[PDB]
Structure formats: C-alpha cells, structure tokens
Amino acid sequence: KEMPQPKTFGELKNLPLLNTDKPVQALMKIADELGEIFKFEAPGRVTRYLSSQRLIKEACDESRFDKNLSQALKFVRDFTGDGLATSWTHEKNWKKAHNILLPSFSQQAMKGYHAMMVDIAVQLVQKWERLNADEHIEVPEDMTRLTLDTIGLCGFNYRFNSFYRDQPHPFITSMVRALDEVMNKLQRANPDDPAYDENKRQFQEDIKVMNDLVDKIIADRKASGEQSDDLLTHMLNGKDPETGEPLDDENIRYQIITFLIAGHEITSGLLSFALYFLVKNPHVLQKAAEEAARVLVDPVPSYKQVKQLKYVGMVLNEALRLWPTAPAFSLYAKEDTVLGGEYPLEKGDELMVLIPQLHRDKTIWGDDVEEFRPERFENPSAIPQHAFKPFGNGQRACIGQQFALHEATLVLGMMLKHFDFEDHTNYELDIKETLTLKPEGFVVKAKSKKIPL
Ligand code: HEM
Ligand SMILES: O=C(CCCCCn1ccnc1)N[C@@H](Cc1ccccc1)C(=O)O
C-alpha cells in the first residue's frame, strides 16, 4: 500500500545513500531492512528496487515491462552509443545489431572461438607454472588479463598481450577512467558546478581516445581485407535479415567498445568469485578438480570437453548466484499495471532488479542461501521462473552469455586440472565496487601438479 522507502536527506531525498564506495552492497542492506520492494528517490527521478522472485517474475513479463537505461547506463551511452547494451528496444539499431550478432554468439560460434580461447588460457597456466616457490597469484588481476585478452583476440584479432605487461593498454586506461567518471558522476550531490569541469574535459578526452583507437581497428581491417573468424569480420560482412542492412562503421565501433567493457572486469569477476568460493569450500573444489582430471584428458582441451565440464558449469552458476558481476538491470512499465496485486504502477514508471538480493530469496533457495552449493543447479527445471537472472531478461538478455561461460569454464577447468590451490592468507572477502564487483586483494598460491600442455 504505502511503499517502503529508506531514510531521506531533505531535498536530496535518498541520493546520499549512494554516496558510498559500495552502493550495491548498501542497497542490499536496505533490501534486508525494508523487504522485497522499496522506493528510491533522487532530485528529479524515482525508481523502485525489487528483491523478491515474487515481484521480479512479474517484472520479467515482456508484455508489461521493457528494458530501461538506468542512470548509470545512460552515462555509459556517452561512449557506447546505440550499441546493443545501451540502445533502447525501439531504436532501429537494436534489433538490427541483435539479428546480425546472434549467430556470432551461439554455441556454434563458440566452436570457432575455442582455439583462440585456448591460446590465452594456456598463457595463464604457463604464467602460474613459472612462478617461483614463495610467490602468489593476484587472482582478479590475472583473471582480467585472461578475459581482456580473450575478447580482444576473439573480438577483432587483436593481442592485448596482457600477460607481457603491467601497464594497462592505452584504450583500457581511457575505458577504466571513463567508467570511473560515470561512477563519480552518479553520486554527485551538485554535479552541475564548474568544479567538475576538469572531470568533464578528461571524460571527453577519454571518449575520443576510445573512438579513435577502435575506429582505426575497423579501418585497418577494411583496408587489409583479412577475413578472420572474429566478431569484427561478422559485423563487417553480416546483413540484418529484417531490414537487409549491414551495421555501419559507427555502430560497429559502439559494439566493440561494449564488448571490451563486458569482457573486462565484468567477466573476470565471475572467475575471481568462482575461485574464491572454491578455495573457501574444499569439498566443492575437490569435486570440481575430480571432474577436470576425468574430462580434460588431453594437453589442450577441446570444445566438446568443455561442454562435458558439467560440475564446473554449476560452480560458475553458483558464483553467479551469490555475486553476479552485472548486479542490476532496469525496466519501465509499458502501460499502467499492478505489481504483485499490491503496487500500482503508471506507464513509464521505472524498476531496478537488484540481482544479488533476488538470488538470496529464501523462499526460492532455502535457509542455506549464503552457502556455496553448486548442486543447486543440477536441474534447471527445479528452479522457479525468473529466480536466477545474472544475464538479464528476455530479448534484452546478455548476448555474450555463451561466450563468457565458455571461456570461464575452459580456464577454470584448466586451472583445476593443473594446480592445487592454497588460501594462504585466509583471505577475508572485501568486495570492491566499480560498476561491477570483485573480491579486492584476493590472493592464492598455486602448486603445480606437473601435468604438461
Ligand atoms: C559474467 C559475465 C557477464 C555477465 C554477468 C553479463 C550480464 C549481463 C546482463 C545482466 C545484461 C542485461 C543488461 C540490462 O538488462 O540492462 C547483459 C547484456 C548484454 N551483455 Fe553481458 N554479461 C557478461 C558478459 C558479457 C560478454 C563477455 C559480452 C560480449 C562479449 C556481453 C555483451 C552483452 C551485450 C551486448 C548485452 C546487451 C544485449 C542486448 O540488449 O541486446 N556480456 N549482460
Ligand atoms: O550491471 C549492469 C548491466 C550491465 C550492462 C553494461 C554492459 N554490459 C556489461 C556486461 N554485459 C553488458 N548495469 C548496472 C551499471 C553498469 C553499467 C555499465 C557496466 C556495468 C554496470 C546498473 O544498471 O546499475
């Protein structure tokens, strides 16, 4: 009836609550206190955060709700344009790029990307094989080396060579700093003052860097004529069956920037959290390592063998359950409608799906919801509708889901085949928030099982 709402700060409404280093975790705590739905107001805007499967299953009804761009996504659109993740469903370029790119992201496409994924995965294993006795691994940093290199190579046949360096690539410097400006711009009480003029000049400089670098990648490929098995070739050559049109070079650039963001720390976060949960749950690690040793019987894994890593796949889903690295998505009501028989919404009203809190709904998962139990995922039919949404919803779901899960299953399987792991610091989980999530400072030691490649 009277929708719950967290504490307000006069004319700033709830905005100061997101002036925090960990806003998603702060919102999760508000959900703990207020329940399945709460209103969140800022100057000139309002949304409603949903946390229960009961309400989110209705929000996922595409006849009633469509994808909205959150304030964060609207700011990211300043450098991802009408790429797939920041276009509205009704923009011509969304359905056009969706139709063109779907065959590039299917399981059949993964068979083609597999060899390049193995290339990078072997580089990761060789790095760890070559560490000296007393040394340790910085898990998120090395996982980000893996995922960035993989999307660079599979995306446009470019070698970031992240395992050869510590200084970030110039593109990544600007990309990370652009995303940082989005974070700072959100939790600005007075974001219009001229005190942020430098931040805005730097922001425009970083957009130009990303545009210039990707634009020349596209120009270089058209000039060379090479037809590699990557996303850029498919975008240069594909035609939308509906309109009959190809993507233009500007939109191709937006897609590439989008893929680079998604394949960076959003994807590496899944691997980082998965390894964290494995080392914190030794019986689960042992079961996953037993599968890896049984299935990965060749020096280089095949595509088919990765598909046979069923338990590793469940490990990844359970890591996505507890700490999904794209932690929210936004919706708007297409028409007047009533949520859950109790909350009337008007056309245009916005919703936020708080994914980590949805995934803690005890009415779905039981009381042991904080425990890491991959066996929860043995049967998708036993999971209620819309209870598990780490890849979003409907036609606006993650197009990269098969790509992320294939590269994650491949390298996690290889990690489990080749090394025993030690939580040598008894690492205390500390989740750093950018626009994604990562276990900050997570370190392990890896002792080789001395299995050759
Ligand atoms: C663990 C890794 C990933 C997670 C958790 C994830 C999560 C998500 C989520 C929740 C959405 C829906 C966003 C919304 O509704 O606003 C989404 C959309 C999208 N993702 Fe991912 N993603 C991952 C990896 C990737 C990768 C590797 C790529 C590409 C190389 C990618 C490309 C996209 C695109 C293009 C969309 C927009 C799809 C559309 O609306 O047509 N993602 N992702
Ligand atoms: O998590 C999400 C959905 C992710 C969509 C962004 C692009 N992408 C990343 C992985 N696949 C697609 N959106 C957050 C904020 C955010 C913005 C940009 C990047 C990450 C996170 C929110 O709306 O609050």
330 CB near ligand 2 (under 6 Å) = yes
CA of 21 to the centre of ligand 1 (A): 23
Residues 6+ apart with CB under 8 A from 144: 162, 264, 265, 268
Residue nearest to atom 20 of ligand 1 (CA): 398
Is there an atom of ligand 2 within 6 Å of 150 CB?
no
Q: Is 152 in the pocket of ligand 1 (CB under 6 A)?
A: no
Ligand of minimum distance to the alpha carbon of 389: 1
Tell me the sheet residues that pair with 445.
422
398 lines ligand 1 (CB under 6 A): yes
Please name the method used to determine this structure: X-ray
Q: Are 118 and 142 a contacting pair, CB within 8 Å? A: no
Question: Which candidate, 386, 267, 277, 282, places its Cα nearest to that of 322?
Answer: 277
**Which domain does 34 fall in, by range?**
1-453
Distance of alpha carbon 221 from alpha carbon 386, whole angstroms: 41
Q: Which two tokens stand for residue 181?
A: 């400006």
Domain count of the chain? 1
Nearest-angstrom CA–CA distance, 168 and 159: 13
Instruction: Establish whether residue 403 lines the binding site of ligand 1, counting it when its CB lies within 6 angstroms of any ligand atom.
Output: yes
Pocket test for ligand 1, best of 398, 412, 438 (most atoms within 8 A of CB): 398
The CA 384 to ligand 2 mean position distance, Å, reads 24
Distance CA 135, CA 301 (A): 27
CB 356 near ligand 1, within 6 Å: no
Query: Residue with the nearest Cα to atom 3 of ligand 2?
Result: 326
* Residue of 435, 436, 438 best suited for mutating to test ligand 2, as the one with most atoms within 8 Å of CB: 435
Which ligand lies nearest to the CA atom of residue 76 in the structure? 2
The rounded distance, in Å, linking the Cα atoms of 259 and 362 is: 34
Q: Can you tell me which atom of ligand 2 is nearest the CA of 330?
A: 23
Q: What is the dihedral of CA 372, 306, 324, 272, to 10 degrees?
A: 80
Q: Is 113 annotated as a binding residue?
A: no
Resolution of the structure in the document, Å? 1.6
Question: Sign of the C-alpha dihedral, residues 237, 238, 244, 248?
Answer: negative
Strands 350-354 and 328-333: antiparallel
Look up residue 245 and give its amino acid.
Answer: E
Q: Which atom of ligand 2 is nearest to the CA of 24?
A: 24
The structure tokens listed for 353 are 């799906």
Q: Which ligand is nearest to the CA of 113?
A: 1
Closest residue by Cα to residue 387 from 29, 59, 47, 23: 59
49 is an annotated ligand-binding site residue: yes
Ligand nearest to the CA of 435: 2
253 alpha carbon – ligand 2 mean position (Å) = 18
